Amino acid sequence: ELPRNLEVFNEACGHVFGSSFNREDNSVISDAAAFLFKMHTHSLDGQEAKVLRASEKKRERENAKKSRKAPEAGMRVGRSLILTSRWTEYCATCVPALGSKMKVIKASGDAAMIQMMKDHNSLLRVCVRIEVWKARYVSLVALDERIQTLEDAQWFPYLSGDSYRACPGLVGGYFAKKAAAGERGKNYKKLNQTAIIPPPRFLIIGHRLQIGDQVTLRELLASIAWGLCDGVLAECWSPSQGDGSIGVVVGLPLQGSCFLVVASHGLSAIADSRIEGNLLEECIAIQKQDGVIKCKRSGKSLYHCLKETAG
Amino acid sequence: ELPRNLEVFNEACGHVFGSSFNREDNSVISDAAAFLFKMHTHSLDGQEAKVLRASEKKRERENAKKSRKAPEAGMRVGRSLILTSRWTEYCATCVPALGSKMKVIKASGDAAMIQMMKDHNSLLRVCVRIEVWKARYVSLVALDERIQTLEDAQWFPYLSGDSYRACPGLVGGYFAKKAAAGERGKNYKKLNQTAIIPPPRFLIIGHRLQIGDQVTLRELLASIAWGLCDGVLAECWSPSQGDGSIGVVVGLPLQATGSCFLVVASHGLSAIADSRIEGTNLLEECIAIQKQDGVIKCKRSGKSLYHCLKETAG
Amino acid sequence: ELPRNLEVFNEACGHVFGSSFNREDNSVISDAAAFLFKMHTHSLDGQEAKVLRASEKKRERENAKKSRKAPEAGMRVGRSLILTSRWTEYCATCVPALGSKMKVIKASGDAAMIQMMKDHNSLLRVCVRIEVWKARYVSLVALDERIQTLEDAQWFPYLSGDSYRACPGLVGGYFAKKAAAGERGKNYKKLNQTAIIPPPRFLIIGHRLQIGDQVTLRELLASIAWGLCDGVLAECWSPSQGDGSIGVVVGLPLQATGSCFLVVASHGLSAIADSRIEGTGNTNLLEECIAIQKQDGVIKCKRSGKSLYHCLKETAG
Amino acid sequence: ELPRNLEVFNEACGHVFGSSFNREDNSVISDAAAFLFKMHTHSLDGQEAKVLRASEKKRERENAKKSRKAPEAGMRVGRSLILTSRWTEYCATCVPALGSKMKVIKASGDAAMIQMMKDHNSLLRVCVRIEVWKARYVSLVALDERIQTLEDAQWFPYLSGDSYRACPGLVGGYFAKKAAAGERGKNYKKLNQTAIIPPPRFLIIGHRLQIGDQVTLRELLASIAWGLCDGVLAECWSPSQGDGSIGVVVGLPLQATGSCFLVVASHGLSAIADSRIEGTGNTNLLEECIAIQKQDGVIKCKRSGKSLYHCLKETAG
RNA sequence: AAAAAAAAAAAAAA
RNA sequence: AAAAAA
RNA sequence: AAAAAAA
RNA sequence: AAAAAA
């Protein structure tokens, strides 16, 4: 009784990976989602070439990709995913032809094509969400060389254009920078570096992250934050008996209003009214089983905190 | 009985919306003004395509809009506005043709066309003023995600280039930024973010906002300010007998061009962002309010209007 | 025995303004230099059109200007300057033909044209200096609205393009910004906002500003600084007996030599914005002292931390 | 005896400059490599004109250059370099024709032309390395005007576009800013401002800079750092017996491995620029140490917090 | 040169 | 969640 | 100080 | 207030 969004992803993953797809390992799920995203974006070998306005170098790249032999059954995608013989049929029948537009399919009135396009959009959104979660998980232990200043970190994650398109509000990077650093329309979404993304194992089954479900410290931190976030958020996780790298969630951080006062009527602008009158003393709000609590900030990034506490 | 702008706005609104147009509802007036602005800007479905210098994407969008069926009679506008069967006649008659210019009509010498063009200009100005007021009102209890720093807030509101063209002195946005960044000639008007705009229910009637008018706190604040201004402006309002929702205006803020307080580096010295703050705590600044008895000064609260409105209601 | 540069300006002003041109009032000289500069840039009515690559709107503007009737004798320029009949003759005979280039005149070899072009260049430089000084003088009591941040104030004065062309070392504005926001060649000049410019009454007669020569407070301040600069420079002037708005110069600020104190990050070290202050952490900026060259010797004066504009406004009453 | 790159540079320099080319003088090699770069970028008088997309002004400049007479044999280059009569032969033979591309020659299949193009690429790389090192060596005792803020100093050195193209990993300037602001592809290289460039007299010989080499202090400092680096790097030098001017290298700094010390705002918290400096508000940034690899082993030297330009002039008094 | 992330080369190159 | 869309 | 040289 | 004008 899962939503069509997750059912489409489950069916696609099954058809493309046979029994080798394990629905309980975050790494396997993330790799499968990335492969499906690449397949549906027309980026694999042997697929159509993006030659609408491609430059000469991009022209040659796309031509080589199209001429390159497409993947074959039995290929190892990642570590524990093996392509089956049915993957070609799924790619041919479900992936929209390059350049397909929803308006054209809707005007055509073809129910099958409309449903296929809707499923494609849902799959793209789910795969992009999984990609964002995986990037957050990776960033916990290995930071990107580009992130050397607060401005650079402001646009994390750094994903591709299609990722930004499918989920504009969760994907940072160059496209989010351009959208923010440029003219913005009514349908503009602001990047949410800490939007709660359930782990892929919970995302694909419709399970919503909450208090009382077993998870890993890295898993929860990625779900609720990324590498450079404050380490105080680690208080949201509590190890179980014997540790064993598996604990439990005890709360989730809260996030909304502003306190800006624009200079008006000869007054001087204020960045924050509360400030007028303490940075290390700032506290975060955690929603516990009993009620909201305020926890003093650690002042150390989750990356540095994990590095220090590793040994 | 009314100026030309108010009279033409009332005539256009009545003709377009029948009796459904409520003249005492601010939301209805704002919706009608937005619809009229869209109509006169050829932004509605089935109107002339803007293709003079349009890029391929803009050409496609305009062609799609033109091919799309125009709004049908009886269509619901906003919440409590319904189009009449005679709106198409007014759209075809009173709307200047795309690319029309005042100089061309003046050369033509047709007095009726000159009157029509002046009416169109006045209607655009009135609609843009109403749009600015409604944007301010929305900002009071609905923060704009586009604003994250004082620089972003400096250009509020963010509206289309048509709005800036009609009322450059009241509309900010990207076009205002472009105008400010370039030179500033004699015709350039600085973006008055806190210019006094009577509420739409008063603007169309022409009753200039003044002390004693029965107005809501939110609407008065929108008229005199917007979401991200100081909460001290709330002192310009006073609930009437029995509390309720409508109070009375007790004062009007004034602004006397706060002088500069900067010192550039020279002869090896170092620049100072503010001579006073050098001496970083300063809440002594006061705002001048013109009350019936006289002009007084109120100490700033230093707290955002949006914050204060939600906090005091808890 | 004045230099040819100032002689040319004096002759031109006389020819164009008759006896109405006073060589002792600074407002009069500012207006005269502004008009003459306009005349030698073909920006007055009835002069040639700069149609080399003009846009449609600029095309219409210049066409209307060319068609527009030229100024007539007896016109009032400013407040105390009246044009004469000889102004048309001087314009025709001394104004280079629009688009004239010094290279072409030199190649042709005509001595008269070479001298005329040299005179025009000198007159342009003189009029640009006077315009810049008047910009600084007006900036003491009425700041430009464009000045709201130090970034904006870094380019003052904001003058037209030809002004920047003639005198690059004093004129700021969009053109100075563009030259800086780019690359510098072998002949790139650095904007010196506070370069000393003799007051116009002293510039047109060759008198060099020094100590012991009567001036007005605002005159000297515009000469050595402008509206936003520090108030300490006010100490360079001392009122005379009975005040009377006329005092005397007691010193001229000594401009410090360019010496950056940055230390960029390297080898894992951390960037420093200023070597001097980072060490002890004395972030206060109210101790820095300016150098004033007095009759006796160099002295250091503590800064006041308040703008000359605000200082004059407050001390006005 | 030498790799291809150094061999080709040696051959070209010898051919063009005869015996006037001294192989142990840094200024001589810098001037020679700059001239050879000019020749190989068609920036000398009497070479093809760059007009592919050149703007009207650029078209005029290039046409004037082409029309201008080319340098004549025996012309003085820099200070102690003189052209021979056989430089025209080398310029005509080994210089690729304007607009040549490696793909075109590869399609041609002429082995001689492929070798000549590879030699041209290697000579561009060598000349750009020498140009960068001389930029640093100038910066030690002559501050560049363009550098006024840490943002300005982030992009040193400021060189031409061809320099950035040939060696992107050392050369800054306008093109480095352009490439950094835009998309960062796989081939994108960051500006390693303080990369080790052996001194010219070591670079052409192929002798890698290491411990024990007899190097003047200024040249070593230009090798490892530049003008606005911290003075601590001066500890890598130790004057030899009898003081003199030539000392020896005692170590070679190491680029400290990255470890992010930032905390972005989230869940209502405030972003922190530096966790360490935060502490309890104590901003004492003088504990940072630079690694130095000595013969005995790796050590750490406490920073001095002063610019190399300042330190070099201060210690000479 | 810390079963799987600097230096030099070859494919790319205002 | 439905709609729209390099 | 000599040379060069626009929305 | 008026006159210009994507």
UniProtKB/TrEMBL annotation, chains C, D:
Origin: domain of life: Viruses
Protein name: Uncharacterized protein
